[model samples]
Target: AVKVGINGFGRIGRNVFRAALKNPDIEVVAVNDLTDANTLAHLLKYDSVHGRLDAEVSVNGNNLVVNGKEIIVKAERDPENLAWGEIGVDIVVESTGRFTKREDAAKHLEAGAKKVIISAPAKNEDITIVMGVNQDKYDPKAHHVISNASCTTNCLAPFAKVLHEQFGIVRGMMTTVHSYTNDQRILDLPHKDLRRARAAAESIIPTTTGAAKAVALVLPELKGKLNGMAMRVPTPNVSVVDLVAELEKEVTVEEVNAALKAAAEGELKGILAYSEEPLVSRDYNGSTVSSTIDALSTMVIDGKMVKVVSWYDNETGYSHRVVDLAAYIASKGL
Candidate 1:
């Protein structure tokens, strides 16, 4: 079994713990979070949909009956201060969104860790891994630093993949009209970057995403040809990926659609799609894979560029990647 270490106990990190407890191949030996043990008791005490870790789950008032043991979960949210190696956690999933700054990751390694993986893209030195796109680039010898590309990258990767394979993308622009995240302000709060500080409940604010520069790392052929931007909408559950590409003039929307459908059918294909219906962002919550390419949105603009809409559950999608990438890392050691 792969011994996994987790950092942060918030939404994605908590979800990572839930996903690992269910996977037989994974063993969550340690977790780090700033929240009190009592706070995570409800989530960790039982399996989310499958079952329990040490025992079955039952709600006992605020407390829970987890694996027949009365366990008080003590969490350490600080990454550079956790004792993961001492507990035999070999694979680390850096689910904490706080350590986007690259230097902090090295501190965790100095504290003792086999490797570091993040839920969001590693902008500094980390190699971005987006399953189907740059997943193949994961080097057993070189991938000690890993990045499970951003939620937007998850949706954009497959959408770009089919396009690149068919027409050979010349250059492209992507706008991710993403859903609300905890990072945004519920009410107005003064923060750096005035546009993002605005209340998430009231507007569609333009933000930045690494997708433009990062997704290329996954699909190397499109390197330097892709760029992206993001807009955080008021919705909380689902997100949309809209891509516009300048094809080689020979490619058509129909060809891109057929290619996307085929990619979803392949092994290690995290990007699934739907062409049968007109899809909206609300349809993507709790989806198992990365993004679903909305084949209906496939269109040719100005005779050469093509546009496609895709949807995904940013949380579940990345959570699944964390677990799967852990397994992949373990296999390399073997």
Candidate 2:
């Protein structure tokens, strides 16, 4: 089994542990969080949107026990100070989303981790890997720190890849109808970003996302042509991507659908799902696919411009990837 350490037991961190529980080849050896073991156990047992977890999760001293597995929960809040080496952690998943810089991730290496993986995209880092999109860029020997990119970027990469490969994108832009995250305030509060200070539960807050730019990291040719924006709405789960592209070659709606259909069934099978059913945010609650192509919403305007909609269960889908990456890296064992 691949031994793992999780630093930060928040939304993504907690879900990573839950996902690891189901994967037979992965074992969570240690977890470092700000909260104590009991609090972590409680949070693991009941999630508002995901509902109660099916397994019996509880705290036994410093260990968070789930089913028959016992995982040590440490309260060390700093990555540089965590004792990853002592516990035999082959890799550490930094789900805190705070320490994203290359040097910051490198600290985990100083703390004795063989590799450190970021749960979000890095502004400057060793690498940013999106499975089934650009995981090929990862080097097990050279790259000590890696980024998984963001949930939205993960949803967009495959979309951009297939379209760019089949028809060659001339330019593209996307708007993500996203659900409110922990970064937003529950009530109108004081903050530097004025609109973000407003209650997320009460507003359709417009924001910026690095998704379009992040995808370019995977598909380098689209560097100057892609852009992105986001709207944080009141919902608590699932997100939509409204992607528009100007292709180099003329293509019909049926052709585009066939391309997505073939991709979903072939190389990108588990990572991408294709669907014709009309789906809402709730329909993707526990989905594991990176993005589900909304077949019913696919459109071709003037045979050169294409509009496609996709749905992603951002939280769970990303957590699955985080665990998968940790496991894959651990399998190599630096």
Candidate 3:
């Protein structure tokens, strides 16, 4: 099994721990965060968004006892201070969202982690991989610090991959209806981004998203072809991606949906899903796939212009991919 250490126990970090528990090939051996072990244990035991964790959780000194496994816990703010090497951690999940640049993330390497996966879009790294889209491009020898991109990018890449491959995208515009995050204030407060300073659960705030530009890093052919923004809604978990694109090939709605369905079942079975039921954001709260195509919402106009909608549990879905990516790296002897 691949021994892993989580650098942050926030939404993404906690979700990654829960997701890793289900993967036989991965084992979480340690966790590092600014919070105390008691608080970390409490949060891990009962998550507001994901509900109760699957295992028994308790704090024993500086360790988090989960389902009979004692995971070492540390309260180090600096990556270089963590005892990753001492505990035999094979990979480090850098979910802190602080050490995103190549130089900063490499501190994990200096601290003795064999590999590092940044949970957000990294400024400079060995490579940026989207599981189903370009994960095979990863070279273990060359990539010590890697990026999983963003949750929005995870939800957008699969749709863009299938569509661009089957129909050939000419140009596209994407708008993600995302949930409010920890970055936003529950009540009105001051922030660098003025729009995010408003009450998070009371309004729809427009913000910028880097998913469109990040997608290009994974799929080079689509570079300079996609652009978009985000709408932070009142919800707290699930998010939907709305994409409008002009296809190179004339296609009907039925054909477009059929292509996506085929990919979901064949090549991208675990990473992508297809759904036709009339559902809302809450219905996908714990979805594991990177993205699920809402077949009923697929639309086509003039046989070339098309729109596609997909849903993702921003926390859970993205966490699953992170575990999957780590497992893949381990399989290659990282």
Candidate 4:
């Protein structure tokens, strides 16, 4: 098993721990968070969004015990100065959501991490890898500071890749009806941005999403052609992506559905799912698939444009890939 180090223990970071515990090939050796060990263990044991964890979780002095597995915990606020090498961590998963810049992410390497994986969509990364889309672009020897992108990008890339491959995209647009994150304020409070400062549970907030631009990094062919925005609704999990693209070829709705269904079952199997059942975000609260297509909602206009809707459990689904990406890099002996 590969020894792992976690830089942050936020929503995504905690889920990364949950996913790592389940993977036999990966072991989280150490973790760093600004919060104390007891507080971290308490939060891990009882997550309001995902519910109580099944495994036995308790604080053993300065470490966490999960299902009899002991993990060292640290209260280091700045990850750049952490002693990752001293603790024998092979790779570090930075879920802090703060170290998105290329230079800052490299700090993990400077601290002795063989590889650093950022959990957010990067602006200037060596490589941004999406599992079913451009995972082949990942080079262990060449790419060090990498990004799994974001949960929104995870859904968009697979949806766009499969469609663009079968029916060449002329241009496209996307809007993510996403669930609220920890970054949002519970009540109308002071924040850096006016739109995000409103009560998250009471209203739908509009914000910019980098998923549209991030997708182009994986699929260079779609650069300058796709753009998107986000609407953070009053939900805890599961995000839906509404994509409309002008296809280069004229096709029927039936054909579009058939192609997606086949991709879900064949090439993109396991990562992409197809469903005709009328489903809501609640139905997919913890879906493992990267993206699930709503087969019944697919449409084609004048045989030139296609509109598709897909859903994904942003938390667990995306975290699973973070572990998978770490294993992929470790397989190359990083």
Candidate 5:
């Protein structure tokens, strides 16, 4: 079995841990959080989990526990000093929402683990695995790194690749109705970013998103042609990607729908899902970042603009890919 470790216990991080525990070929051996207590202990202390696990757990220390799986709790933030070797684990996933900086990731390897993958997009010249689109981009010879991009990047990638392949895109723009994050303030607080300074509870906060930028990595031709924006909504989960494009060809609405529907059928793999059930985001239950396309949204307008909508349970959707990506890299002996 392949062993992995996670460094955060937030929405994305916790779901990554939960879903990973059930994988037959993968196991989570170490987990950490910045809280004052054990990550799992804090999770169990809250009566919020809806189901029973295969077994219960026993606390081994203040921030440590021995459950069905093994996990060593690290209290520090710097990866190089996390004591990964002492715990008998090497691959560590940094979901802390911190350390997007390459310099910080370097700390992980210096401390002990052979590899480190980030939970969010990083500005690194190397180290990213977008799975379905560019798992081939990862290099095993260059170890000690990777970034899994973000939920928005993961969903937009397949759509952009599809367009870049079938009909070249003239240009495109996207708006992701993203979920509210901890970055938002309960009440208006003075924040550096303009829109984020507003109260997250009351209005839609317009903000910047790296979706378009990251999408280019998975689909290179999309780099200069695409741009993106974001709206942090009131909802706690799931978001819609509103993509508008001017295609190189004047494809009809019917033809566009046919193409996307066909993508759902097989050629696009299981990633591009085209559905006709008049569904909402809830329809994406058991979804991965790969399953983002909503067939109903396929439309061509006024000889140029084509629009599409894709949904993702950002937490369970793309974060689940973190495990898949780790396992993918491990298979390459990194």
Candidate 6:
């Protein structure tokens, strides 16, 4: 098993730990967060969005006991101060959303970790990867600090790859109907983004999405060809991506759905899914796949204009991909 350490015990961090639990190749040996071990143990045992964990969870001094494994827990606020080397941590999943720059993320390497995977889109890093899109391009010899990209990027990249491959994408626009995150204020409060200061559940807030730009990082040909925005809704987990694009090849609604369905069944089997059922946001709460194409919602206009819709459990689904990337890196003996 590849020994792993998780930084930050927030939504993405907790979900990554949960996803790693099911993968026999991953062994979580350490966890670093500002929160105390007791609180972290309790939060890991019971998650409101993902429900309770199947294993027995307890705190043994500074260690978190899950099932029969004891994971060392630390409260270091700086990555440089972490003792990853002492425990022989092979990979560190940086989920604090703070140390995203190459230099900051490399602090883990200086502290003894072999590699670091940022949980969000990095400011400047070795490379940004999205599974099933351009993950095969990952070069461990050249890339050290890596990015799994954002949850939105993971949800958008797979189908975008299919669309661009089958019918070339000329230009595209997207809007993600996303769920409110920890960054948003639960009640009206002071914040840097005035719109996000409003009560999260009381209003729908409009914001910008980095997925369009981040997608280009993984799929270079799409650079300068895609743009998008975000709508933070009242929901807590599932998110839907609505993309309208101009395609080089004229396509029908059935043709687009058929292409996506084929990809879901073959090449992109585990990373993408095709769904024809009538379902809502909550239906995808624990979906492991990055995106589930909503066949019933796909549309095309004038044969050249096309629209595609896909659903994703922003937290759980994205975390699964994170684990996949980590396991891949480990398999390469990086």
> In model 2, where do residues sit more than 4 Å from their true spots?
none
Question: Whose lDDT is higher: candidate 3's or candidate 5's?
Answer: 3
Better of 2 and 6 by lDDT: 6
Candidate 1 per-residue lDDT over residues 1-334, each given as its tens digit: 8777777767787778766766789877666765655557656655333234455655454333445533223355566667665766677788777776567776677667777888887758467777766666677777666788777787787767776776778999988888888788888898787887899979999988877777767887787998888889887767878888888866666777777888777843656656558656666666867778777778887668888787877777768878988887787772
Residue by residue across 302-323, what tens digits does model 6's lDDT show? Answer: 9999989999999988999999
Weakest ten-residue segment in model 4 by summed lDDT: 74-83
For each candidate in the order shown, give its overall lDDT on alpha carbons.
0.73, 0.88, 0.93, 0.89, 0.74, 0.92
C-alpha displacement of 102 in model 6, angstroms? 0.6
Number of backbone-clashing residue pairs for each candidate, in the order shown:
8, 0, 0, 0, 2, 0
On TM-score, who's better, 2 or 5? 2
The residue-by-residue lDDT of candidate 2 on 184-218, one tens digit each, is 89999887778789899998999989998888788
Ten-residue region with minimum lDDT total, candidate 3: 75-84
Candidate 4 residue lDDT tens string, 126-221? 899998888887787899989998999899888789888999999999999999988889998998978889999898899988889888888999
Task: Mark the regions of model 3 whose C-alpha exceeds 4 Å error after superposition.
Answer: none
Model 3: per-residue lDDT, tens digit, 177-247? 99999999999899999999999999999999899988999999999999999999999899999999999
TM-score of each: 0.87, 0.97, 0.98, 0.97, 0.90, 0.99
Per-residue error (Å), model 3, residue 127: 0.5
Residue 35 of candidate 5: its Cα lDDT?
A: 68
